[PDB]
């Protein structure tokens, strides 16, 4: 006992010196931050097609900077095995994002961008305008719809163009280029009224939001149906509408009594809301 507490002291006093080193090693091991699964590709260009041409092979997040834009911006590019680079400006798939937004929000964009293309979003109207009119090259718009049974359909529009804010980001195209979803932008003959199809077509319609009414109705379509869209009086195609789980819904499930879901009257009844929606553009010569 005279020299017993001489060792239990120097022995563990040594262990401390050794431990401190293990501690120093743990320190070096905890300097890095959590790894983020989302990353932005390096290649850039005027649009996704320009990016696909430079050799990009993966669908994902890329910055693009159309000629006339004075600042680049992020976008989700869809690049297929044939060198086509689609620039997606709209996506609905689970109802996680509120689409009842104002003029500015629809102008600058809202929602989120994912490398995996699994999120809802609306790129900005300004960006959609900058992309579709950056040069003399005509663009095409592809509408992709999926119902609650796994069936999908498409609608293509040639010479797609969204005007500047001065013209309320007016929607314009030369002609429906086919697709089994049907040309809902050409309006729909819902019933008796003979001015039916006329007032529900979308070509040439300016954009509307509850706070910026630019439709052909004495009322406020955008506010009534809680969305931002190229409203006429009011619509036959409504992809930025209220998301309804299961698709089926009725006038009883709406505050104002109007069909405000994600509809495409030429493919499904206005009381049936899509499960997934995709609005993407690419240079026209790319489909021909």
């Amino acid at each position: 006992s005279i020299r017993y507490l001489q060792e239990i002291y120097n022995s563990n006093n040594q262990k401390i010196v050794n431990l401190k080193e293990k501690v120093a090693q743990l320190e070096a091991q905890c300097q890095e931050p959590c790894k983020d699964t989302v990353q932005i590709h390096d290649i850039t260009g005027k649009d996704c097609q320009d990016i696909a041409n430079k050799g990009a092979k993966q669908s994902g997040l890329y910055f693009i900077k159309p000629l006339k834009a004075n600042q680049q911006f992020l976008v989700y590019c869809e690049i297929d095995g044939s060198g086509n680079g689609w620039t997606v400006f709209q996506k609905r798939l689970d109802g996680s994002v509120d689409f009842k937004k104002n003029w500015i929000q629809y102008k600058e964009g809202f929602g989120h961008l994912s490398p995996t293309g699994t999120t809802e979003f609306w790129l900005g109207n300004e960006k959609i305008h900058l992309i579709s009119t950056q040069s003399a090259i005509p663009y095409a718009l592809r509408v992709e719809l999926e119902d609650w049974n796994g069936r999908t359909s498409t609608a293509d529009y040639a010479m797609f163009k969204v005007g500047p804010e001065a013209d309320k980001y007016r929607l314009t195209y030369a002609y429906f280029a086919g697709g089994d979803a049907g040309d809902a932008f050409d309006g729909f003959d819902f019933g008796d009224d003979p001015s039916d199809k006329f007032f529900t077509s979308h070509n040439g319609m300016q954009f509307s939001t509850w706070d910026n009414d630019n439709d052909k109705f004495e009322g406020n379509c955008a506010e009534q149906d809680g969305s931002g869209w190229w409203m006429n009086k009011c619509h036959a195609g409504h992809l930025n509408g209220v998301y309804y789980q299961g698709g089926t819904y009725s006038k009883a499930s709406t505050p104002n009594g109007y069909d405000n879901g994600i509809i495409w009257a030429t493919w499904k009844t206005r009381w049936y809301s899509m499960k997934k929606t995709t609005m993407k553009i690419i240079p026209f010569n790319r489909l021909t």
């Binding site: 819902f190 019933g191 007032f199 529900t200 109705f217 009322g219 379509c221 009086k233 009011c234 109007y258």
Partner: peptide, 4 residues
């Protein structure tokens, strides 16, 4: 939809 259409607004009569």
């Amino acid at each position: 939809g259409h607004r009569p």
